[PDB]
Design a protein around this ligand. Structure first.
Ligand SMILES: CCCCCCCC/C=C/CCCCCCCC(=O)OC[C@@H](O)COP(=O)(O)O
Lengths: 218, 339, 291, 56
């Protein structure tokens, strides 16, 4: 009974440290980085700052963690449920692949992956930040190759703005929970370096809306 | 030409194996066990509850002493508890918050864990300083580590989603042996009492019995209609049980090379995450995604109780070597001891 | 010194009020309207409470504060119902103790209602200005504010009976509450006004913060939030302004016609209690459906 | 995929050659080992609280 009490103090200290760590980690935004192969996700990671990679950074007194699982190459259906509760899902897609083929168009594969992730039973209330990279290449390629290669239903002049807006709508139309979740789109810009600002603003809006939802101010 | 004749030979040999399994099947388990009397309802109440985890619990394991246990949570914590006094003995912070398995060495000196990091982290508890330290970090797998069990104090068997398993020597750090043959992500494994053989289950709806020394596969067992999430070994060492996502458990035999009993119910459609046997092998405790665990009579396939004390998916289930308790851990961040 | 031996007739004659021992049309009219409002308040708040109880989704601090507000409104309705069947002619038979108790019940009930409104505003301001997701529950704070609310209400209700009354200083009595003093009226009015301005400030800060940090990015949340805020504030204003004005006139202006519109103003202040639940439980679709 | 088929066949050959005993004997041995350890299973036969460390 003499030494049996020190275990109680050890347990109390362990619980205090656990509570402190939980309070420290609860105020850290969590982002899941996804995207089909041969995308601009590496560029995003570089702009921010062998199975899974973690990138921690800070912006305007707000800490963010980004988890990349590109080196898994396994059945996603088994481990996708591990990222439940993350603050957002950053989905990267390159437009330049609208005509490239890996057979099949990589754009259709990216759209299938987006439909599988967004409409997943685990991610029913998480927000998605869509990064349509390779804006310059897609703007300079449409001048010769039309968008009809992938989207034959498209009808419009071969211009950057029209085709980009059409692709944005096509990617946003795959969402089914139009009211539970919202999708934030941003065409990546390298010169301005505002991607982190966009992510910060999106996360802030998400948090504010959740708070309003929680205190009866729907 | 070669591919066609090889395919035909494989098909004919599989048919021959089927005919052999059929010929050796003269009766069924239930028919021989109809004379024995049931054991009745098994009522087990929560005797202790463990709190402290701030996120989902993904795995646990009991020690040889049947008193200390371990549990990993997505919060980046691996907690070692004392079941008797529900006192948090150890709390190790992981460099990666993605962990999906735990292992307590039989000697109790080392512990292991792994997950999406694809590394098996061996921690030495009995260090001179008194503060746990990462003893080793086994790498080489090309997928997530699903299960790991300490075969000894220096060797360890691990399974990954790369469709292979690996026996490692902790000291050297290199794969002592590699086991291939599976066509899907291996999700669970179980060691035999003698440690000379071990069975592994994958998402290909098939299990395989591998030998350690020779490094070859002895037998392959089928029958499931979906992935295999858990698997346990019978104490006698001559049979095992497998749990899948199709809401069904199945008992396979080694010598007979055929299934014996199927534990399933029409009212259950949820998946299975963990299964365990009693010290006598009469009972079979299986955790489901219906927020509860079910106790089946191995020799009769009749439910003998229901453990309903969790508000979320039951992720892990374990039984001690003594057989005087059962531990259950769920995504609700709570562990519960029964009887 | 203190005139505890005299009857209620002396107190009512010292002022300009009239006993009216005989029944009258206005008395029956106000009694009917009051009992109607009381049954409405009680039914609505009991429905809110049972809905929060049966449904387990509403097990958060905000819903606990809403349930406490509903209970306070139910208590106010019960106190107003007890005030009926005891006013006008029956007032001629009540003694000092019964009179003080009757007034203190209404006082404590309405103070509890106002304090619950203020606490709801504070909790909303807190929950809006956090920067975390999946925050853990903390019932200690809501329990603490609830007990503080009820203690302050009971204190404001018991104070007038214990020592603070016009029994020992008759020269300065109220014209509507002959036994109560005017200092208590001023204190109550100041408390109400500070609570109201605090609520307004908090909600305005909330609106500004939300607008600023969501302008950079189907239905616009700005319009809905503005509507909710303006409604919450306007109900309070239209339901508690004339009563405060009447108390202020009673304490400040002699020879003012104050004894006329007191009962209507009290009825309006009570109808505030019926408006509160429908105001704080109509946006929530799940709450409405639970009914 | 000649090497893969070769390895698969060479592996299944070892599975084809097994000294399998009748399933009746398997069930008999299972029931025997299950009945010979009945007194040793606490859960199957609840032990008095005096011997349960999880009670007192
Ligand atoms: C005048 C109404 C103001 C609005 C309601 C808020 C009152 C909150 C309480 C504040 C403490 C001081 C209140 C003094 C005025 C209360 C007058 C009153 O509520 O009496 C009830 C009256 O009918 C019946 O009078 P009798 O027929 O003589 O019994």
């Amino acid at each position: 009974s003499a030494e049996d009490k020190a275990a109680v103090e050890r347990s109390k200290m362990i619980d205090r440290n656990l509570r402190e760590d939980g309070e420290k980690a609860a105020r850290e935004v969590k982002l899941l980085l996804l995207g089909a192969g041969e995308s601009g996700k590496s560029t995003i990671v570089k702009q921010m700052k062998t199975g899974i990679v973690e990138t921690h950074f800070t912006f305007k007194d707000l800490h963010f963690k980004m988890f990349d699982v590109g080196a898994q190459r396994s059945e996603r259906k088994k481990w996708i449920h591990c990222f439940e509760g993350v603050t957002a899902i950053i989905f990267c897609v390159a437009l330049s692949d609208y005509d490239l083929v890996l057979e099949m168009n990589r754009m259709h594969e990216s759209m299938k992956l987006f439909d599988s992730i967004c409409n997943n039973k685990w991610f029913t209330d998480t927000s998605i930040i869509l990064f349509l990279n390779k804006k310059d290449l897609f703007e300079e390629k449409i001048k010769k190759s039309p968008l009809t290669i992938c989207y034959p239903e498209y009808a419009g002049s071969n211009t950057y703005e029209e085709a980009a807006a059409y692709i944005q709508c096509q990617f946003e139309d795959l969402n089914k929970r139009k009211d539970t979740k919202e999708i934030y789109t941003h065409f990546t810009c390298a010169t301005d370096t505002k991607n982190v600002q966009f992510v910060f603003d999106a996360v802030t809006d998400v948090i504010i809306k959740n708070n309003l939802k929680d205190c009866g101010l729907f | 030409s070669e591919l066609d004749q090889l395919r035909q030979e494989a098909e004919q040999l599989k048919n021959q194996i089927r005919d052999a399994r059929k010929a050796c099947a003269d009766a069924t388990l239930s028919q021989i066990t109809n004379n024995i009397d049931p054991v009745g309802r098994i009522q087990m109440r929560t005797r202790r509850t463990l709190r402290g985890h701030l996120a989902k619990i993904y795995a646990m394991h009991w020690g040889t002493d049947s008193r200390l246990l371990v549990s990993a949570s997505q919060d980046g914590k691996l907690i070692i508890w004392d079941s008797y006094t529900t006192n948090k003995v150890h709390a190790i912070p992981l460099r990666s918050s993605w962990v999906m398995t735990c292992a307590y060495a039989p000697s109790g000196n080392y512990v292991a864990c792994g997950g999406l990091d694809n590394i098996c982290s061996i921690y030495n508890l009995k260090t001179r300083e008194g503060n746990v330290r990462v003893s080793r970090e086994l790498a080489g797998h090309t997928g997530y580590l699903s299960c790991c069990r300490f075969l000894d104090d220096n060797q360890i068997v691990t399974s990954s989603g790369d469709t292979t398993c690996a026996l490692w020597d902790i000291e050297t750090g290199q794969q002592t042996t590699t086991f291939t043959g599976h066509t899907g992500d291996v999700m669970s494994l179980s060691l035999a009492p003698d440690t000379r053989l071990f069975v592994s289950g994958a998402c290909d709806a098939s299990a395989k019995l591998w030998d350690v020394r020779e490094g070859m596969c002895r037998q392959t067992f089928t029958g499931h209609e979906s992935d295999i999430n858990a698997i346990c070994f019978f104490p006698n060492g001559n049979a095992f049980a497998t749990g899948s996502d199709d809401a069904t458990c199945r008992l396979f035999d080694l010598r007979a090379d055929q299934e014996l009993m199927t534990y399933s119910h029409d009212n259950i459609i949820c998946g299975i995450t963990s299964v365990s046997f009693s010290k006598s092998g009469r009972l079979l405790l299986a955790g489901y995604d219906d927020f509860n665990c079910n106790v089946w009579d191995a020799l009769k396939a009749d439910r003998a109780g229901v453990l309903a004390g969790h508000d979320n998916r039951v992720s892990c289930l374990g039984v001690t070597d003594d057989g005087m308790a059962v531990a259950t851990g769920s995504w609700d961040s709570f562990l519960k001891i029964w009887n | 010194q203190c005139f505890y031996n005299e009857s209620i007739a002396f107190f009512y004659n010292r002022s300009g009020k009239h006993l009216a021992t005989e029944w009258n049309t206005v008395s029956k009219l106000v009694m009917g309207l009051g009992i109607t409002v009381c049954i409405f308040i009680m039914l609505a708040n009991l429905l809110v409470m049972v809905a929060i109880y049966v449904n387990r989704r509403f097990h958060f601090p905000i819903y606990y504060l809403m349930a406490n507000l509903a209970a306070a409104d139910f208590f106010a309705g019960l106190a107003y119902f007890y005030l009926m069947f005891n006013t006008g002619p029956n007032t001629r038979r009540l003694t000092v103790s019964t009179w003080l108790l009757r007034q203190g019940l209404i006082d404590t009930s309405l103070t509890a209602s106002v304090a619950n409104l203020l606490a709801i505003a504070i909790e909303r301001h807190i929950t809006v200005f956090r920067m975390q997701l999946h925050t853990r529950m903390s019932n200690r704070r809501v329990v603490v504010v609830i007990v503080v609310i009820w203690t302050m209400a009971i204190v404001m209700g018991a104070i007038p009976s214990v020592g603070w009354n016009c029994i020992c200083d008759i020269e300065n009595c109220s014209n509507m509450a002959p036994l109560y003093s005017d200092s208590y009226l001023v204190f109550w009015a100041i408390f109400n006004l500070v609570t109201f301005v605090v609520m307004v400030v908090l909600y305005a800060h909330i609106f500004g913060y939300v607008r600023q940090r969501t302008m950079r990015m189907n239905r616009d949340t700005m319009m809905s939030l503005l509507k909710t805020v303006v409604i919450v504030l306007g109900a309070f204003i239209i339901c508690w302004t004339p009563g405060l004005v009447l108390l202020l006139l009673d304490v400040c202006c002699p020879q003012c016609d104050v004894l006329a519109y007191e009962k209507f103003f009290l009825l309006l202040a009570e109808f505030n209690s019926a408006m509160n639940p429908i105001i704080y439980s109509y946006r929530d679709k799940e709450m409405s459906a639970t009914f | 995929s000649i090497a893969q088929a070769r390895k698969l066949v060479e592996q299944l050959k070892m599975e084809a050659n097994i000294d399998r005993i009748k399933v009746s004997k398997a069930a008999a041995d299972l029931m025997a080992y299950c009945e010979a350890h009945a007194k040793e299973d606490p859960l199957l036969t609840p032990v008095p609280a005096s011997e349960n460390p999880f009670r007192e």
